[PDB]
Design an enzyme around this catalytic site. Structure first.
Site, PDB file in Angstrom:
ATOM      1  CB  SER A  14     -10.304 -28.885  13.233  1.00 43.34           C
ATOM      2  OG  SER A  14     -10.275 -28.099  14.409  1.00 43.34           O
ATOM      3  CG  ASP A  35      -5.146 -36.506  19.928  1.00 42.40           C
ATOM      4  OD1 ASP A  35      -4.406 -36.157  20.873  1.00 42.40           O
ATOM      5  OD2 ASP A  35      -5.531 -35.720  19.034  1.00 42.40           O
ATOM      6  CB  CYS A  52     -10.206 -25.997  16.960  1.00 44.92           C
ATOM      7  SG  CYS A  52     -11.574 -24.884  16.575  1.00 44.92           S
ATOM      8  CG  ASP A 121     -12.378 -49.010  16.111  1.00 46.97           C
ATOM      9  OD1 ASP A 121     -13.602 -48.902  16.335  1.00 46.97           O
ATOM     10  OD2 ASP A 121     -11.902 -49.902  15.375  1.00 46.97           O
ATOM     11  CB  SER A 162       0.798 -25.963  13.873  1.00 48.10           C
ATOM     12  OG  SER A 162      -0.371 -25.273  14.265  1.00 48.10           O
ATOM     13  CB  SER A 200       0.624 -11.787  20.501  1.00 44.29           C
ATOM     14  OG  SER A 200       1.276 -11.044  21.514  1.00 44.29           O
ATOM     15  CG  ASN A 223       9.391  -6.754  12.130  1.00 49.33           C
ATOM     16  OD1 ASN A 223      10.613  -6.601  12.151  1.00 49.33           O
ATOM     17  ND2 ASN A 223       8.816  -7.879  11.721  1.00 49.33           N
ATOM     18  NE  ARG A 228       5.425 -10.097   7.339  1.00 49.18           N
ATOM     19  CZ  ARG A 228       5.097 -11.152   6.599  1.00 49.18           C
ATOM     20  NH1 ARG A 228       4.171 -12.000   7.025  1.00 49.18           N
ATOM     21  NH2 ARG A 228       5.696 -11.362   5.433  1.00 49.18           N
ATOM     22  CG  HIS A 461     -30.682   2.940   9.385  1.00 51.67           C
ATOM     23  ND1 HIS A 461     -29.382   3.310   9.655  1.00 51.67           N
ATOM     24  CD2 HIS A 461     -31.466   3.901   9.927  1.00 51.67           C
ATOM     25  CE1 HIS A 461     -29.379   4.446  10.330  1.00 51.67           C
ATOM     26  NE2 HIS A 461     -30.632   4.824  10.511  1.00 51.67           N
TER      27      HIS A 461
HETATM   28  C1  LIG Z   1      -4.736 -19.749  20.529  1.00 52.01           C
HETATM   29  C2  LIG Z   1      -5.305 -20.216  19.215  1.00 52.01           C
HETATM   30  C3  LIG Z   1      -6.487 -19.655  18.740  1.00 52.01           C
HETATM   31  C4  LIG Z   1      -7.038 -20.062  17.524  1.00 52.01           C
HETATM   32  N1  LIG Z   1      -8.217 -19.475  17.090  1.00 52.01           N
HETATM   33  C5  LIG Z   1      -8.717 -19.876  15.947  1.00 52.01           C
HETATM   34  C6  LIG Z   1      -9.952 -19.269  15.488  1.00 52.01           C
HETATM   35  O1  LIG Z   1     -10.591 -18.396  16.073  1.00 52.01           O
HETATM   36  N2  LIG Z   1     -10.395 -19.761  14.277  1.00 52.01           N
HETATM   37  C7  LIG Z   1      -9.777 -20.737  13.515  1.00 52.01           C
HETATM   38  O2  LIG Z   1     -10.299 -21.075  12.446  1.00 52.01           O
HETATM   39  N3  LIG Z   1      -8.616 -21.301  13.957  1.00 52.01           N
HETATM   40  C8  LIG Z   1      -8.125 -20.887  15.111  1.00 52.01           C
HETATM   41  N4  LIG Z   1      -6.964 -21.455  15.561  1.00 52.01           N
HETATM   42  C9  LIG Z   1      -6.321 -22.475  14.734  1.00 52.01           C
HETATM   43  C10 LIG Z   1      -7.042 -23.814  14.758  1.00 52.01           C
HETATM   44  O3  LIG Z   1      -7.327 -24.203  16.103  1.00 52.01           O
HETATM   45  C11 LIG Z   1      -6.149 -24.858  14.096  1.00 52.01           C
HETATM   46  O4  LIG Z   1      -5.722 -24.332  12.844  1.00 52.01           O
HETATM   47  C12 LIG Z   1      -6.818 -26.209  13.855  1.00 52.01           C
HETATM   48  O5  LIG Z   1      -6.812 -26.966  15.066  1.00 52.01           O
HETATM   49  C13 LIG Z   1      -6.144 -26.981  12.742  1.00 52.01           C
HETATM   50  O6  LIG Z   1      -6.706 -28.308  12.689  1.00 52.01           O
HETATM   51  P1  LIG Z   1      -5.792 -29.581  12.768  1.00 52.01           P
HETATM   52  O7  LIG Z   1      -6.676 -30.813  12.979  1.00 52.01           O
HETATM   53  O8  LIG Z   1      -4.909 -29.601  11.585  1.00 52.01           O
HETATM   54  O9  LIG Z   1      -4.928 -29.332  14.082  1.00 52.01           O
HETATM   55  P2  LIG Z   1      -5.272 -29.860  15.537  1.00 52.01           P
HETATM   56  O10 LIG Z   1      -6.786 -29.692  15.730  1.00 52.01           O
HETATM   57  O11 LIG Z   1      -4.456 -29.143  16.545  1.00 52.01           O
HETATM   58  O12 LIG Z   1      -4.848 -31.400  15.478  1.00 52.01           O
HETATM   59  C14 LIG Z   1      -3.657 -31.877  16.140  1.00 52.01           C
HETATM   60  C15 LIG Z   1      -4.017 -32.989  17.093  1.00 52.01           C
HETATM   61  O13 LIG Z   1      -3.127 -34.112  16.893  1.00 52.01           O
HETATM   62  C16 LIG Z   1      -2.550 -34.493  18.126  1.00 52.01           C
HETATM   63  N5  LIG Z   1      -1.209 -35.018  17.865  1.00 52.01           N
HETATM   64  C17 LIG Z   1      -0.083 -34.296  17.567  1.00 52.01           C
HETATM   65  N6  LIG Z   1       0.987 -35.030  17.368  1.00 52.01           N
HETATM   66  C18 LIG Z   1       0.533 -36.327  17.547  1.00 52.01           C
HETATM   67  C19 LIG Z   1       1.179 -37.577  17.476  1.00 52.01           C
HETATM   68  N7  LIG Z   1       2.475 -37.728  17.193  1.00 52.01           N
HETATM   69  N8  LIG Z   1       0.436 -38.682  17.708  1.00 52.01           N
HETATM   70  C20 LIG Z   1      -0.862 -38.536  17.993  1.00 52.01           C
HETATM   71  N9  LIG Z   1      -1.578 -37.413  18.087  1.00 52.01           N
HETATM   72  C21 LIG Z   1      -0.819 -36.336  17.851  1.00 52.01           C
HETATM   73  C22 LIG Z   1      -2.584 -33.242  18.996  1.00 52.01           C
HETATM   74  O14 LIG Z   1      -2.544 -33.575  20.380  1.00 52.01           O
HETATM   75  C23 LIG Z   1      -3.926 -32.633  18.577  1.00 52.01           C
HETATM   76  O15 LIG Z   1      -5.029 -33.184  19.289  1.00 52.01           O
HETATM   77  C24 LIG Z   1      -6.385 -21.053  16.780  1.00 52.01           C
HETATM   78  C25 LIG Z   1      -5.206 -21.618  17.250  1.00 52.01           C
HETATM   79  C26 LIG Z   1      -4.658 -21.211  18.463  1.00 52.01           C
HETATM   80  C27 LIG Z   1      -3.377 -21.841  18.946  1.00 52.01           C
HETATM   81  C1  LIG Z   2     -40.486   4.049  16.535  1.00 50.65           C
HETATM   82  C2  LIG Z   2     -39.981   3.790  15.141  1.00 50.65           C
HETATM   83  C3  LIG Z   2     -38.859   2.988  14.951  1.00 50.65           C
HETATM   84  C4  LIG Z   2     -38.369   2.726  13.671  1.00 50.65           C
HETATM   85  N1  LIG Z   2     -37.247   1.924  13.530  1.00 50.65           N
HETATM   86  C5  LIG Z   2     -36.802   1.700  12.319  1.00 50.65           C
HETATM   87  C6  LIG Z   2     -35.626   0.863  12.165  1.00 50.65           C
HETATM   88  O1  LIG Z   2     -34.987   0.330  13.073  1.00 50.65           O
HETATM   89  N2  LIG Z   2     -35.237   0.690  10.848  1.00 50.65           N
HETATM   90  C7  LIG Z   2     -35.859   1.225   9.734  1.00 50.65           C
HETATM   91  O2  LIG Z   2     -35.395   0.975   8.617  1.00 50.65           O
HETATM   92  N3  LIG Z   2     -36.963   2.011   9.892  1.00 50.65           N
HETATM   93  C8  LIG Z   2     -37.399   2.229  11.123  1.00 50.65           C
HETATM   94  N4  LIG Z   2     -38.513   3.009  11.283  1.00 50.65           N
HETATM   95  C9  LIG Z   2     -39.149   3.564  10.089  1.00 50.65           C
HETATM   96  C10 LIG Z   2     -38.609   4.938   9.723  1.00 50.65           C
HETATM   97  O3  LIG Z   2     -38.642   5.808  10.855  1.00 50.65           O
HETATM   98  C11 LIG Z   2     -39.465   5.531   8.608  1.00 50.65           C
HETATM   99  O4  LIG Z   2     -39.949   4.481   7.780  1.00 50.65           O
HETATM  100  C12 LIG Z   2     -38.681   6.527   7.761  1.00 50.65           C
HETATM  101  O5  LIG Z   2     -38.294   7.622   8.593  1.00 50.65           O
HETATM  102  C13 LIG Z   2     -39.461   7.015   6.562  1.00 50.65           C
HETATM  103  O6  LIG Z   2     -38.824   8.202   6.050  1.00 50.65           O
HETATM  104  P1  LIG Z   2     -39.653   9.316   5.324  1.00 50.65           P
HETATM  105  O7  LIG Z   2     -38.712  10.394   4.775  1.00 50.65           O
HETATM  106  O8  LIG Z   2     -40.578   8.693   4.326  1.00 50.65           O
HETATM  107  O9  LIG Z   2     -40.485   9.942   6.520  1.00 50.65           O
HETATM  108  P2  LIG Z   2     -39.860  10.757   7.728  1.00 50.65           P
HETATM  109  O10 LIG Z   2     -38.401  10.354   7.875  1.00 50.65           O
HETATM  110  O11 LIG Z   2     -40.664  10.536   8.954  1.00 50.65           O
HETATM  111  O12 LIG Z   2     -39.891  12.244   7.219  1.00 50.65           O
HETATM  112  C14 LIG Z   2     -41.106  13.021   7.243  1.00 50.65           C
HETATM  113  C15 LIG Z   2     -40.784  14.422   7.702  1.00 50.65           C
HETATM  114  O13 LIG Z   2     -41.735  15.344   7.131  1.00 50.65           O
HETATM  115  C16 LIG Z   2     -42.059  16.319   8.091  1.00 50.65           C
HETATM  116  N5  LIG Z   2     -43.368  16.859   7.749  1.00 50.65           N
HETATM  117  C17 LIG Z   2     -44.590  16.284   7.969  1.00 50.65           C
HETATM  118  N6  LIG Z   2     -45.603  16.991   7.526  1.00 50.65           N
HETATM  119  C18 LIG Z   2     -45.001  18.106   6.960  1.00 50.65           C
HETATM  120  C19 LIG Z   2     -45.522  19.241   6.310  1.00 50.65           C
HETATM  121  N7  LIG Z   2     -46.825  19.451   6.109  1.00 50.65           N
HETATM  122  N8  LIG Z   2     -44.647  20.165   5.864  1.00 50.65           N
HETATM  123  C20 LIG Z   2     -43.341  19.964   6.057  1.00 50.65           C
HETATM  124  N9  LIG Z   2     -42.733  18.939   6.654  1.00 50.65           N
HETATM  125  C21 LIG Z   2     -43.624  18.035   7.084  1.00 50.65           C
HETATM  126  C22 LIG Z   2     -41.985  15.607   9.434  1.00 50.65           C
HETATM  127  O14 LIG Z   2     -41.683  16.563  10.443  1.00 50.65           O
HETATM  128  C23 LIG Z   2     -40.804  14.649   9.216  1.00 50.65           C
HETATM  129  O15 LIG Z   2     -39.579  15.227   9.650  1.00 50.65           O
HETATM  130  C24 LIG Z   2     -39.025   3.287  12.565  1.00 50.65           C
HETATM  131  C25 LIG Z   2     -40.146   4.089  12.749  1.00 50.65           C
HETATM  132  C26 LIG Z   2     -40.634   4.344  14.028  1.00 50.65           C
HETATM  133  C27 LIG Z   2     -41.854   5.206  14.202  1.00 50.65           C
END
Ligand SMILES: Cc1cc2nc3c(=O)[nH]c(=O)nc-3n(C[C@H](O)[C@H](O)[C@H](O)COP(=O)(O)OP(=O)(O)OC[C@H]3O[C@@H](n4cnc5c(N)ncnc54)[C@H](O)[C@@H]3O)c2cc1C
Ligand SMILES: Cc1cc2nc3c(=O)[nH]c(=O)nc-3n(C[C@H](O)[C@H](O)[C@H](O)COP(=O)(O)OP(=O)(O)OC[C@H]3O[C@@H](n4cnc5c(N)ncnc54)[C@H](O)[C@@H]3O)c2cc1C
Ligand SMILES: c1cc2c(ccn2CCC2CCNCC2)cc1-c1ncc(C2(N3CCCC3)CCCCC2)s1
Ligand SMILES: c1cc2c(ccn2CCC2CCNCC2)cc1-c1ncc(C2(N3CCCC3)CCCCC2)s1
Lengths: 492, 492
Positions: A14, A35, A52, A121, A162, A200, A223, A228, A461
């Protein structure tokens, strides 16, 4: 005539590639890249593109996605979907092939990236350090193998990544790491993954979904609590949900020896005497920096207490023209952090616009099932370096899982602030969406967002992510490093 | 003495409930809330909880979720999941039953909240204004119906939401709205949603999933492109992906009349002259503020020229102590906007800190398949407002979908900018995870984040959200309102 190279890079991972590209195309510098393979897979697994691309990020996400489908199929019934239940088959051989084709696609693009970019190269083979200005390529990692190149270098970047840490117990040859798991011919009926880290855990869900009928994925950890380093409540929750999904989480346990059975299955004895029979034993107990094959003693490059390479805020070593990035530094083993360190190393040297990479407040994920998202500090770390600490908690079972049939999938969200100015120090998510949600959160921490900035934002939400805007009062505090609910009356 | 409250809320919906709860639990005020039902369904549909809980955000989300499983089951084949394809079928009755249970549970919990919170009382009936300080609750929406109660009110809050608009065409009797669509006995084989808005699009996806064999969803919109007010590119991509799934989109078309057929199906005749035979005709051409039954004339509450209740930035009406929030104001018809409008109203009236709801840079969503997440301005509007406008854009088909087979599912991620300083003016996403991604992007805009603040942030690998921290150079510009792929000249 052809001189040296304005920069040679060992390891095309990397970070290795982001540095060689930002130099050949951004600064017209001569660049070499060494390499040990061009395509993913055995015998070296990692190849051109890094861990990586070959045996990490990309192939893991693809396999987790495929594993999520186990849950999808099961949960569709709640929404009225029916289909022959006993006819479902999780075809692991088909999954691995799809993955292999994805990886090789990237392998070739990079393969072509070198063939039409002057100054950039690619040199196949193993890179060892000769002089402080010479990189040695050899056909194999053996220091006494035949040489194919000697690259004169003005600047040398160490980016070897490593390697998986293996323990010293009898029968460790019968074990595999994450590397070999990507290439199992068949899915294992019984698998044991050792250790508590994200690797692991992520592979426990994968094996758990593609296991043939009658299988058990056992995860062991030496442990008490897995994951850890991550937030506590998220740890216990993830443990609970892994159990719910059928994974046996076996804590306070450590393999002591492994033997073969008459059928090739592995017989595992623990330090506590208990035995377990599995078809695969995967070690994921840690990743060590990959420095052995570099001959760093020939020039005197210094190493930290851990086997990693020492560097400063600019990726420089004791040797004046030798730098190191990526996992070889033993810091934040993440891919974008190696891409950031690499891009930064270049335009501080070949661009005289010195800019270093920030290692704090970094977003990361844990594509487990359920996935994890995190950014910043956890509460118990903030305590040891912050006067008054506030913790916002919220653990609702998501909307759809009353129908889905998966009531256990409790979504968790923690925020951590410095109660003085309300500045957010951490954000920790558990539940589907956590990886995609946390990303935009990383931008907020880069902008010093106080908690007020969160709950004063109008929600989208319905989403899980809106729960971050719905927390207006702390659930407990950390003042002086101590944890009590209420926050005792002022008194300076 | 009795029946003399601090606040009387007409409408126990999103904005109403927030208002009352806060007024009673945060400031110990005597609160009364009036609504026409305690549980979802006919004959009134909306009920305790509002439109969102009973016939809005909550129910549709669950049904979209259920419709996503049509894609999931199909996409799982790419990841090695096998099963008798011909045995798949969706049970529309189980979906509704499941949704009813989930909605009912919310209805049940909101009640009991009243039963357990002193100073918060619910009144089943129809509310209307008798005088400036008296709310009457009658047995029906008719003024001639029996009085149940007369509530003395120091403050009255109008929160009755909106109602489906139904065009006055002959045969309209044979049509339904979103309200009745939530309770259909069976899924329509042939269906025609009318309107280019988010309600028509969202339902198109649900009907498209559950239609019985040989069905056909048909969406029509009297203009040339659906989802006016959304980012154009997203508008046109969602159109393509809808067609890609089976939904036929009839644009520049508007129904002119409906008639019954012998079998009992519908015979639509559009203005242009074409005709379509469908089993259901769902109108979703808009929603009008529900001012019909409030008797606003008895007091003189002025309406807006567009038809909503006229309110200043503090939700105050022309009449003192009478306030309005939510869809009845005909502004942003979104649940969190009303909720925020309600919580602000209570803080202002019953606190010592004025608060007004910011109505700009509100992050909303649209749960099509795939979904849309957006927040802030779109290109056109930004070009009307700012001098130089930059547009960062990124569009691709994720790798996970090159494998799943759903290759049309192209992710989109625009970013609008004022090039005079870099401040992000809007963000527009399309594809899996967009609604979750956009939530924290709403926090960033409240902080006036700049384009640099995004690309200088370290990303989370691998995720769709990375694409936001990866656009460094504008894809094109908008100088003085005109579009151009590159800027003018020099500009020191
Ligand atoms: C299972 C696993 C999962 C991982 N998951 C993540 C993750 O999700 N996110 C993350 O950020 N990191 C992750 N890592 C760590 C990450 O891959 C390493 O930290 C990263 O590769 C470090 O970069 P580097 O270039 O220093 O090492 P490397 O990329 O490993 O560089 C070493 C290279 O040098 C070569 N080399 C070694 N000795 C010699 C030599 N004498 N002559 C020539 N070439 C040589 C090796 O063959 C290899 O190609 C993970 C590591 C493992 C083992
Ligand atoms: C299909 C759908 C999907 C949505 N998805 C999302 C989403 O993913 N994310 C998001 O942020 N927003 C979403 N919204 C928007 C969200 O539902 C509304 O913007 C939000 O509920 C507004 O809240 P409110 O209290 O102003 O109105 P409401 O939460 O609708 O409250 C009004 C309440 O007043 C009551 N009421 C009405 N008239 C009277 C009355 N005369 N007397 C007493 N009670 C009364 C009603 O029964 C109702 O319970 C969605 C809306 C719809 C329609
Ligand atoms: C891919 C294919 C390329 C080239 C150059 C040529 N090719 C194909 C060669 C052709 C041969 C004939 N057949 C068609 C392909 C370059 C690439 C690139 N990947 C990634 C690139 C970038 N970083 C490189 C390392 C990680 C991403 C360049 C820096 C900005 C991000 C993308 S650039
Ligand atoms: C639900 C059930 C309640 C109460 C109060 C009592 N109940 C049930 C009684 C039992 C509950 C379990 N323990 C035993 C008593 C309050 C609620 C609430 N939901 C949501 C609430 C919120 N706004 C109130 C008006 C619409 C939503 C305000 C609190 C934060 C969530 C949103 S408040």
């Amino acid at each position: 005539m052809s001189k040296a190279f304005d920069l040679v890079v060992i390891g095309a991972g990397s970070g290795g590639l982001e540095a060689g590209w930002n130099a050949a195309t951004l600064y017209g510098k001569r660049v070499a890249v060494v390499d040990v393979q061009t395509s993913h897979g055995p015998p070296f697994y990692a190849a051109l593109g890094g861990t990586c691309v070959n045996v990490g990020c990309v192939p893991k996400k693809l396999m987790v996605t495929g594993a999520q489908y186990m849950d999808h199929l099961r949960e569709s019934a709640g929404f009225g979907w029916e289909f022959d239940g006993s006819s479902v088959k999780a075809n692991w051989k088909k999954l691995i092939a799809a993955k292999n084709e994805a990886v090789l696609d990237i392998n070739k693009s990079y393969e072509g990236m070198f063939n039409d970019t002057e100054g950039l190269d690619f040199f196949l083979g193993w890179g060892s350090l000769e002089s402080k200005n010479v990189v040695v390529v050899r056909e194999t990692a053996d220091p006494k193998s035949a040489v194919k190149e000697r690259l004169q270098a003005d600047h040398i970047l160490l980016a070897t990544g490593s390697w998986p840490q293996m323990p010293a117990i009898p029968g460790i040859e019968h074990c595999i790491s994450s590397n070999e798991a990507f290439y199992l011919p068949e899915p294992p009926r019984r698998v044991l993954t050792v250790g508590g880290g994200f690797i692991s855990v992520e592979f426990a869900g994968i094996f758990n979904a593609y296991k043939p009928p009658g299988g058990k994925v056992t995860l062991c950890y030496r442990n008490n609590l897995i994951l850890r380093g991550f937030d506590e409540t998220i740890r216990e929750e993830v443990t609970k949900q892994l159990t719910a999904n059928g994974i046996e989480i076996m804590t306070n346990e450590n393999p002591a020896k492994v033997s073969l059975n008459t059928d090739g299955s592995k017989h595992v004895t623990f330090e506590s005497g208990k035995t377990l029979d599995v078809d695969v034993v995967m070690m994921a107990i840690g990743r060590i920096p990959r420095t052995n094959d570099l001959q760093l003693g020939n020039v005197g490059v210094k190493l930290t207490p851990k086997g990693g390479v020492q560097v400063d805020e600019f990726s420089r070593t004791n040797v004046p023209n030798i730098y190191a990035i990526g996992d070889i530094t033993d810091r934040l083993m993440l891919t974008p952090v190696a891409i950031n360190e690499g891009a930064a190393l270049v335009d501080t040297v070949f661009g005289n616009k010195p800019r270093k990479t920030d290692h704090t407040r970094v977003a990361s994920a844990v594509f487990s099932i359920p996935p994890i998202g995190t950014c910043g500090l956890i509460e118990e770390v903030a305590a040891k370096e912050f006067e008054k600490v506030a913790v916002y908690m919220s653990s609702f079972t998501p909307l759809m899982h009353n129908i889905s049939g998966s009531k256990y999938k409790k979504f968790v969200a923690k925020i951590v602030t410095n109660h003085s100015d309300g500045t957010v120090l951490g954000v920790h998510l558990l539940g589907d969406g956590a990886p995609e949600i946390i990303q935009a959160v990383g931008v907020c921490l880069r902008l010093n967002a106080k908690i007020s900035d969160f709950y004063n934002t109008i929600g989208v939400h319905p989403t899980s992510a809106e729960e971050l805007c719905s927390m207006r009062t702390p659930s407990y505090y950390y003042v002086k490093g101590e944890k009590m609910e209420k926050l005792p009356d002022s008194n300076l």
